[PDB]
Design a protein around this nucleic acid. Structure first.
Ligand code: DCT
Ligand code: MG
Ligand code: MG
Length: 539
DNA sequence: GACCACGGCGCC
DNA sequence: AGGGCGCCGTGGTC
């Protein structure tokens, strides 16, 4: 079936390529091929051959299209079997597996990659026949979103490198005072970054009670959660918690980011993986910029490093209580839909409760703390953890949970139907019909089954919120382009854009609107917008 | 070097 | 008897 034709391929051919590395913005185009009909074209000079393509269709299209943009070519990504398969089963996340599961082997030869894309797409397209909903999501959301993600990856984000460079030396000194004291307290040095070594010290040398064990190995845990419980037992516990904060921030953001600045751009270029999560959410790789610090003071100092190009502004937009809103529409609960119809904020109300202060006294970080209480309790958190979290009597934690769901009656009924259907159907789905398979919903082991159940009914909520953000990006991108503004990052229910100073407001105004009206629900979708020279200030 | 499991933890 | 991610060291491989 496979013949070999001279490079020049016919329009609509399936691309096949090989990079020196995973990152499109950093990689070297080692090989470029194409497959169409029954023939296969191997470009003798890849980079140069890229100028020939009208579009990138095939496994990981967006990736070669990011390279193209990096090279000055506006090569947009088109059909990509990974998206088709990802939609059929979100557990389809790598070419390797999609190929073994659908008709081929993922190799290192571009030509074979081009052939495989063609045949893989044929199979998978057949599979989508009759799946009007998956076809809708593919054609109306994913395929076009892939293009958006490529421009985003190619564009990147500006970072105050000199700023992080000095920040390092500074905390490096604070980490020394903390480890120097932790060692004194223990009465001798040891690797503080070694959970095993600290375990021995905390539980064997000192006489601290072991409050928990680790999952796969069963070792006594030394988690922040355990350390919190032990904070009052020994002076060495607080010192260790602070050390862990600093070292985590410094080793994960403070030190690595400046070293990832691209030479040709001077900006940071993260990957936005389109087929990596079970719920339909994107993910950020290599630099993972979807988890930049924001909670603690040093975390905030780190976020400030993310800045706009001079004369530009960072416009940050974030849907409000997004998953509580999605849930009011999915559940159809009147109490909850009214909550939003009345402009109430459950994070503020829960935070007002937690800290026992009027609503107007709740500050940003206090409200943020409530988020983990609201989403945790919604998604199955237990009274024990709740109490052990809010540091309240187990009984008072039970009451908060009891009342939480009593206040929103239709939610449990919805969670119930979602699970039932998941058991029968074999999968759960989002508002737009994105599916996630949860076979374990019928496991005999209560442990496994109940855990499956929790991931099961979370998917529709989490996934619908993602479908929504993805639609908004697809809708918003063309207008920003028309406005000379750029889309830099997506943080699940937040978008970080960059717009010319003289246009920053019109852009914030527009994006906010596109986002809020993406797909009308039983509840309004509110978006808080912020503008500033840096990410922290934007929010 | 490269890469793995595991614990641990940053954000959503 | 919260869900979804990816990255960083520590140990231990190859
Ligand atoms: N602990 C968390 C935090 C967030 N999320 C999910 C649900 C909300 C979504 C986006 O997170 P945020 O923007 O931090 O939350 P939000 O509830 O939309 O609230 P707001 O933007 O009003 O602070 O991610 C979650 O499952 N668990
Ligand atoms: Mg939000
Ligand atoms: Mg957010």
């Amino acid at each position: 079936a496979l013949e070999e034709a001279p490079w020049p391929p016919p329009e609509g051919a399936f691309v096949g390529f090989v990079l020196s590395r995973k990152e499109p913005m950093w990689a070297d185009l080692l090989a470029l091929a194409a497959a169409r009909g029954g023939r296969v074209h191997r470009a003798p000079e890849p980079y140069k051959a890229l100028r020939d393509l009208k579009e990138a269709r095939g496994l990981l299209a967006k990736d070669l299209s990011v390279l193209a943009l990096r090279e000055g070519l506006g090569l947009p990504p088109g059909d990509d079997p990974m998206l088709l398969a990802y939609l059929l089963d979100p557990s389809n996340t790598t070419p390797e597996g999609v190929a073994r599961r659908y008709g081929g082997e993922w190799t290192e030869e571009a030509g074979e990659r081009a052939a495989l894309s063609e045949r893989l797409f044929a199979n998978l397209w057949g599979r989508l026949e009759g799946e009007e909903r998956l076809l809708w999501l593919y054609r109306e959301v994913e395929r076009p979103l892939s293009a958006v993600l490529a421009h985003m990856e190619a564009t990147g984000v500006r970072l105050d490198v000199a700023y992080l460079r000095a920040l390092s030396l500074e905390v490096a000194e604070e980490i020394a005072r903390l480890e120097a004291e932790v060692f004194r307290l223990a009465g001798h040095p040891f690797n503080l970054n070694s959970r095993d070594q600290l375990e021995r010290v905390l539980f064997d040398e000192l006489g601290l009670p072991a409050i928990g064990k680790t999952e796969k190995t069963g070792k006594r845990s030394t988690s922040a959660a355990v350390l919190e419980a032990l904070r009052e037992a020994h002076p060495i516990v607080e010192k260790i918690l602070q050390y862990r904060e600093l070292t985590k921030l410094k080793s994960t953001y403070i030190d690595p980011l400046p070293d990832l600045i691209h030479p040709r751009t001077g900006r940071l270029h993260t990957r936005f993986n389109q087929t990596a999560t079970a719920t339909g959410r994107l993910s950020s790789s290599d630099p993972n910029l979807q988890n930049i610090p924001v909670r603690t003071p040093l975390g905030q100092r780190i976020r400030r490093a993310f800045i706009a190009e001079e004369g530009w502004l960072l416009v940050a937009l974030d849907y409000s209580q997004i998953e509580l809103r999605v849930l009011a529409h999915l559940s159809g609960d009147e109490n909850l839909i009214r909550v939003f119809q009345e402009g109430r904020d459950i994070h503020t109300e829960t935070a007002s409760w937690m800290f026992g202060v009027p609503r107007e006294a709740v500050d940003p970080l206090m409200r943020r703390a409530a988020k983990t209480i609201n989403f945790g309790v919604l998604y199955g958190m237990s009274a024990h953890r709740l109490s052990q979290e809010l540091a309240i009597p187990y009984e008072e934690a039970q009451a908060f949970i009891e009342r939480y769901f009593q206040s929103f009656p239709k939610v449990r009924a919805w969670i119930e139907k979602t699970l039932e259907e998941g058991r029968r159907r074999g999968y759960v789905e989002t508002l737009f019909g994105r599916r996630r398979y949860v076979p374990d919903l019928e496991a005999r082991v209560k442990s496994v089954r109940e855990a499956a159940e929790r991931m099961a009914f979370n998917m529709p909520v989490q996934g619908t919120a993602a479908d929504l953000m993805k639609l908004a990006m697809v809708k918003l991108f063309p207008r920003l382009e028309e406005m000379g503004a750029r889309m830099l990052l997506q943080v699940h229910d937040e978008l970080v854009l960059e717009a010319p100073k003289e246009r920053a407001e019109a852009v914030a105004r527009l994006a906010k609107e596109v986002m809020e009206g993406v797909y009308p629900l039983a509840v309004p979708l509110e978006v808080e917008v912020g503008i500033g020279e840096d990410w922290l200030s934007a929010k």
